[PDB]
Amino acid sequence: TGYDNREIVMKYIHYKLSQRGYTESEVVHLTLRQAGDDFERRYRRDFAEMSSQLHLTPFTARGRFATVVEELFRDGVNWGRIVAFFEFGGVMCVESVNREMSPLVDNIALWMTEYLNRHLHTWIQDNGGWDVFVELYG
Amino acid sequence: CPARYGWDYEC
């Protein structure tokens, strides 16, 4: 579902960028937006430490992103770490637009869907699908 | 997973 995953990332990043003032899948999209919101308000200090791990510049390679997010999933995947992953990406995008590097947003959106598709969807399909995320978080 | 982040407790 690489198509659906790219769409989920773009909806979340678009939501997040507009919030900071810079029938199919709709229920997953809505749930994820809510989850990211709850997460950022609950885990402010902890999220600041995650975000401080990486500042994307026009120089930065997907590897550097992959290494910081690998550490988040070092010893497994839970829905709370997946929400952290989406908020992380959001923060990178907001930092990018804030410092007039708006073209990095599309780069970050691709990095996120590739990490989703390769490292996370595999876990999701053994842990109840997006339907389970929706009933947990929606 | 072993809890390394405050969000791990809700899972």
Numbering used by the authors:
A (entry chain A): 7 to 28, 88 to 203
B (entry chain B): 1 to 11
Task: Provide the publication's sentences verbatim.
These proteins bind to and sequester the apoptosis effectors, as well as the apoptosis sensitizers, BIM, BID, PUMA, NOXA, BAD, BMF, HRK and BIK5,6. An elongated hydrophobic groove is thus formed along the surface of BCL-2 and BCL-XL proteins, spanning approximately 20 Å to serve as the binding site for the amphipathic α-helical BH3 domains of their pro-apoptotic partners. Herein we present cyclic peptides (CPs) with nanomolar-level binding affinities to BCL-2 or BCL-XL, and further reveal the structural and functional mechanisms of how these CPs target two proteins in a fashion that is remarkably different from traditional small-molecule inhibitors.
Therefore, we measured the binding affinities of cp1 to both BCL-2 and BCL-XL using a SPR assay. To understand the beneath structural basis for this selectivity of cp1, we co-crystalized and determined the complex structures of cp1 bound to BCL-2 and BCL-XL proteins with high resolutions at 2.1 Å and 2.0 Å, respectively. In both structures, the electron densities for cp1 were well defined. Two residues of cp1 (i.e. cp1-Y5 and cp1-W7) are buried in the hydrophobic pocket formed by F104, Y108, F112, M115, L137, F138 and A149 of BCL-2 (F97, Y101, F105, L108, L130, F131 and A142 of BCL-XL). The cp1-R4 forms hydrogen bonds with E136 and L137 of BCL-2 (E129 and L130 of BCL-XL), and cp1-D8 forms a salt bridge with R146 of BCL-2 (R139 of BCL-XL), a conserved arginine residue of the pro-survival proteins known to interact with a conserved aspartate residue of the BH3-only proteins. It is noteworthy that the main-chain N atom of cp1-G6 forms a hydrogen bond with the carboxyl group of D111 in BCL-2. Therefore, we speculate that the D111/A104 discrepancy between BCL-2 and BCL-XL may be mainly responsible for the selectivity of cp1, while the M115/L108 pair is perhaps not as crucial as the former one. To test the essentiality of D111, we generated a BCL-2 D111A mutant and measured its binding affinity to cp1 also using SPR.
